[PDB]
Amino acid sequence: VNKERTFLAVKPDGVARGLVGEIIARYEKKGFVLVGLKQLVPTKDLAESHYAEHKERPFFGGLVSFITSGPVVAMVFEGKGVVASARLMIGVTNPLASAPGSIRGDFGVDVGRNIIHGSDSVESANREIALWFKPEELLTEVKPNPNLYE
Amino acid sequence: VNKERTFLAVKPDGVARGLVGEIIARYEKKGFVLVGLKQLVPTKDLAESHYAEHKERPFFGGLVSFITSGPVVAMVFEGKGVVASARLMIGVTNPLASAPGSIRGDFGVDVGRNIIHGSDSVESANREIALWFKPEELLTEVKPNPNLYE
Amino acid sequence: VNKERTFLAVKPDGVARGLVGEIIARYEKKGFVLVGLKQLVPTKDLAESHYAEHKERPFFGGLVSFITSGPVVAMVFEGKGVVASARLMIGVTNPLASAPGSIRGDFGVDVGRNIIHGSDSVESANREIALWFKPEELLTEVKPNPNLYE
Amino acid sequence: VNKERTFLAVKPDGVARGLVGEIIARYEKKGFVLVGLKQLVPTKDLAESHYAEHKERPFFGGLVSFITSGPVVAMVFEGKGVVASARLMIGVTNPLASAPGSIRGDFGVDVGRNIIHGSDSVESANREIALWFKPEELLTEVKPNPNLYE
Amino acid sequence: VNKERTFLAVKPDGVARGLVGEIIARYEKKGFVLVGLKQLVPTKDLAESHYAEHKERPFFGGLVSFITSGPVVAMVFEGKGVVASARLMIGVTNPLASAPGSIRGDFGVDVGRNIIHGSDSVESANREIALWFKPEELLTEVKPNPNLYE
Amino acid sequence: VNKERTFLAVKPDGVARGLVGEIIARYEKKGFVLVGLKQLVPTKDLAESHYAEHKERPFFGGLVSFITSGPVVAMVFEGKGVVASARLMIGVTNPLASAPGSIRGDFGVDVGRNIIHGSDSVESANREIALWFKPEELLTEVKPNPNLYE
Numbered sequence: 056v057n058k059e060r061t062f063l064a065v066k067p068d069g070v071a072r073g074l075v076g077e078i079i080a081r082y083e084k085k086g087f088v089l090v091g092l093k094q095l096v097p098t099k100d101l102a103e104s105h106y107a108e109h110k111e112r113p114f115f116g117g118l119v120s121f122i123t124s125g126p127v128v129a130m131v132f133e134g135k136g137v138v139a140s141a142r143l144m145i146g147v148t149n150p151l152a153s154a155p156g157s158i159r160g161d162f163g164v165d166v167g168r169n170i171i172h173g174s175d176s177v178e179s180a181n182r183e184i185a186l187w188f189k190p191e192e193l194l195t196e197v198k199p200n201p202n203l204y205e
Numbered sequence: 206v207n208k209e210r211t212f213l214a215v216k217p218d219g220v221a222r223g224l225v226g227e228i229i230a231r232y233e234k235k236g237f238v239l240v241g242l243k244q245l246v247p248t249k250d251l252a253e254s255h256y257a258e259h260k261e262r263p264f265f266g267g268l269v270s271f272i273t274s275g276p277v278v279a280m281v282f283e284g285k286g287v288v289a290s291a292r293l294m295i296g297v298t299n300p301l302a303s304a305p306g307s308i309r310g311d312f313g314v315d316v317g318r319n320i321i322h323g324s325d326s327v328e329s330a331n332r333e334i335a336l337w338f339k340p341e342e343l344l345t346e347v348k349p350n351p352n353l354y355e
Numbered sequence: 356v357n358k359e360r361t362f363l364a365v366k367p368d369g370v371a372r373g374l375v376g377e378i379i380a381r382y383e384k385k386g387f388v389l390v391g392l393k394q395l396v397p398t399k400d401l402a403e404s405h406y407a408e409h410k411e412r413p414f415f416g417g418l419v420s421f422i423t424s425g426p427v428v429a430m431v432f433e434g435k436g437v438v439a440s441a442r443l444m445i446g447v448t449n450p451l452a453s454a455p456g457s458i459r460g461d462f463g464v465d466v467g468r469n470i471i472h473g474s475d476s477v478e479s480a481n482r483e484i485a486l487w488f489k490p491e492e493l494l495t496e497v498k499p500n501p502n503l504y505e
Numbered sequence: 506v507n508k509e510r511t512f513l514a515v516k517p518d519g520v521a522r523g524l525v526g527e528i529i530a531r532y533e534k535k536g537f538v539l540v541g542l543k544q545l546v547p548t549k550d551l552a553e554s555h556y557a558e559h560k561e562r563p564f565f566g567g568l569v570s571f572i573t574s575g576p577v578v579a580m581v582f583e584g585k586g587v588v589a590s591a592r593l594m595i596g597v598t599n600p601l602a603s604a605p606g607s608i609r610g611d612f613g614v615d616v617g618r619n620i621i622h623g624s625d626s627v628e629s630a631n632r633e634i635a636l637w638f639k640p641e642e643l644l645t646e647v648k649p650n651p652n653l654y655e
Numbered sequence: 656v657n658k659e660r661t662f663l664a665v666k667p668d669g670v671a672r673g674l675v676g677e678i679i680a681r682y683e684k685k686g687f688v689l690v691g692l693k694q695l696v697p698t699k700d701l702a703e704s705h706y707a708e709h710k711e712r713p714f715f716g717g718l719v720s721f722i723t724s725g726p727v728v729a730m731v732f733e734g735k736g737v738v739a740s741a742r743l744m745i746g747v748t749n750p751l752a753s754a755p756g757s758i759r760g761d762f763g764v765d766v767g768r769n770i771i772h773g774s775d776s777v778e779s780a781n782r783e784i785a786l787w788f789k790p791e792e793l794l795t796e797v798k799p800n801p802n803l804y805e
Numbered sequence: 806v807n808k809e810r811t812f813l814a815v816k817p818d819g820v821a822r823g824l825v826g827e828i829i830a831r832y833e834k835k836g837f838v839l840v841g842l843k844q845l846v847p848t849k850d851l852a853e854s855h856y857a858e859h860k861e862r863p864f865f866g867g868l869v870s871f872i873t874s875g876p877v878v879a880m881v882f883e884g885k886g887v888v889a890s891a892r893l894m895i896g897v898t899n900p901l902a903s904a905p906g907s908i909r910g911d912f913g914v915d916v917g918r919n920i921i922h923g924s925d926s927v928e929s930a931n932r933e934i935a936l937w938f939k940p941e942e943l944l945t946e947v948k949p950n951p952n953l954y955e
């Protein structure tokens with residue numbers, strides 16, 4: 056189904072570096088539809104719930120602090136296999152090991168300052184989208200370019 | 206002062222044509238700070254109160270019908286002389302008469318489908334910003350790149 | 356009417372400099388439809404007919420000699436006010452005096468090597484299109500993006 | 506030898522999405538020479554002869570029907586190892602699995618709407634070129650930039 | 656003559672903002688040849704000799720101070736009418752009044768942080784070139800692309 | 806450490822092809838700092854020292870004769886893991902086998918005309934930096950964008 060959605064979030068460093076439009080453009084060019092978009096300064100309760108799976112890890116504390124250190128541009132894109140395509144486009148955890156052409160591969164140098172977040176699966180996508188967006192904030196009537204899908 | 210703000214809105218045709226990120230990128234490159242950003246399908250009352258100055262004009266009906274025909278990406282940029290600079294970058298009412306280099310000049314061909322809206326003065330900017338954004342949605346602590354301002 | 360057409364031609368120097376795709380992309384982003392496209396090495400008869408209005412000027416000789424010195428990418432774009440918009444986008448006769456943003460303004464430095472040709476009026480557009488293109492080579496059913504025209 | 510040629514074709518979806526110039530630009534930047542270029546609406550005979558190898562497969566029908574559904578920009582590029590490089594730049598059959606940086610990787614989302622066609626070998630290139638282009642439409646004297654070849 | 660040269664200098668703000676490559680690329684696309692290039696932290700004596708004309712002006716102190724506050728990428732471009740073309744491409748003194756498409760028009764917002772310096776005339780170019788560059792640092796054998804000049 | 810440095814050099818072909826600005830921009834976008842920059846026409850001994858390891862190889866003759874055949878834009882970038890990241894961005898020895906997204910992958914076609922040089926290790930970087938740059942020509946103080954490093 057082409058009604059698959061994922062959660063993307065340009066982090067404080069990506070926003071502070073003027074990468075918001077560049078990132079949105081990459082997804083628009085690919086053919087994914089922006090189902091939701093907004094800028095906010097994450098709160099602790101949200102950063103913590105968002106990174107729940109790492110609550111046990113050492114870095115968790117630093118993850119929750121930086122994400123709430125400034126504005127974030129949260130967004131939702133819809134399309135066929137968007138969760139895996141979104142991540143392929145982002146690159147890998149370490150921006151230095153990310154191939155040229157990917158977001159992190161082109162603009163990132165540190166793992167702590169890795170510009171953007173992308174859901175790693177449909178299960179997490181759905182959880183994260185419900186965490187950052189209210190239903191009233193997501194488009195229902197989507198309908199994509201007919202030159203994209205058969 | 207560099208704490209001046211303006212209201213920009215990528216209209217249904219700009220959004221539907223995948224111009225959102227391209228437009229945001231132009232403002233970020235310039236040095237202006239994104240103080241608010243969100244996507245929504247305008248409601249008739251908002252379309253009408255926004256286009257108030259034209260309620261007596263023939264085309265008003267089509268303005269309100271179109272802007273509410275699909276999602277709009279509303280946004281607020283802050284910076285020195287941003288209202289006038291924003292409009293200079295947008296181009297003129299008729300995209301066919303807009304010089305290359307400007308948004309409408311590069312992507313527009315019809316006056317009714319002219320991609321974006323920009324406040325025409327600080328008085329209107331202030332009015333519109335309050336019409337589309339709630340105070341909680343606008344960043345307070347702005348702070349731009351020190352290499353932009355003396 | 357939006358069924359207006361103009362004749363553009365990337366000249367030997369524009370082609371030899373790898374500017375073909377860059378120029379086509381500029382027009383496509385604008386909203387104009389490619390109704391005809393082909394690469395060929397102009398014959399004297401066609402060069403002369405094309406530059407008829409300059410047959411009595413000193414430079415005519417050099418014009419006819421150069422346009423036939425290599426391959427030319429002839430093309431026809433359709434859209435509202437395309438003839439004047441195409442020219443506005445090209446720039447002026449002398450690339451050095453052409454504004455940044457325009458084709459000649461960005462890539463040209465000499466008037467003899469001014470990269471591209473564009474019809475100067477609908478009258479000449481129609482004459483030139485018939486000179487370079489056979490009716491069978493031009494699209495009849497054009498129909499552009501609905502987000503371009505009201 | 507650097508006189509190797511390949512057949513590329515931006516399909517109806519690539520054309521209708523305004524990607525013609527973008528794709529041509531990528532090949533010109535690389536250093537390949539455009540030996541033939543033209544736009545046309547393929548006929549059934551040409552669509553079928555082209556996809557001959559697939560005549561017995563299920564999808565054939567949809568392949569022929571789509572490629573003839575609208576205008577195609579056929580083109581031939583010449584250069585060292587152009588057939589393999591052209592394919593490397595196109596990406597893989599499934600645009601979702603295509604790496605960022607490649608044509609399909611950047612703009613494609615469905616395999617039925619995968620933007621461009623490229624010959625898979627020198628044997629097929631030679632066949633297809635003769636299928637789409639008449640000898641008079643192809644450049645004889647090519648000669649590429651001396652800063653490209655040793 | 657096409658052996659005209661001009662002196663451009665990306666100031667500390669332009670360099671600190673990652674604009675060096677972007678600026679060099681605009682000039683290379685145009686067709687001008689890079690006759691000299693280097694990065695350095697200007698010394699007072701040089702900054703002062705450079706801005707000699709403004710020695711009596713109020714802002715003089717601030718000019719010499721800023722230009723020496725960080726690295727500058729000094730460069731010399733050669734080409735027909737390069738002194739006037741360079742400035743046309745830079746924009747005007749106040750970046751907010753500079754038209755989209757120009758360097759200052761696209762990236763600058765403050766007159767004190769106006770990104771780049773360009774000679775204002777052939778007399779000044781020759782003076783500044785000799786101030787920043789030693790003869791051994793400038794190319795003798797220039798020879799530009801033949802597709803540029805007639 | 807983030808004080809790692811590598812030596813990059815746009816060779817005569819990259820320079821002659823107007824690729825200098827394009828290449829530097831890729832590194833600046835990434836987040837690496839330009840610690841040294843200059844254009845020169847390599848002298849025979851510099852070329853030879855530089856390519857010591859290839860001395861006994863059949864092609865050392867043309868390697869030296871080429872690097873010294875025209876101007877080279879030598880430069881030093883600083884940042885975390887810059888030597889390995891720089892290489893990854895350049896692509897592989899044969900540009901035809903280099904992935905789209907990489908410098909060689911996007912612009913190169915021949916191995917003898919492979920646009921750019923990058924150090925292959927920290928040991929070589931340090932050797933080459935000292936070979937091409939005098940200590941006075943390199944910056945001491947770095948100050949990397951704080952949104953790059955944690």
Ligand SMILES: O=c1ccn([C@H]2C[C@H](F)[C@@H](COP(=O)(O)OP(=O)(O)O)O2)c(=O)[nH]1
Nearest residue numbers: 864867868897898899916917919922923925
């Ligand atoms: O057969 C050959 C192989 C490489 N080369 C040149 C290109 C390059 F600058 C130099 C060093 O090659 P190598 O170290 O293998 O590749 P790279 O590190 O990518 O430059 O050899 C040739 O001229 N001929």
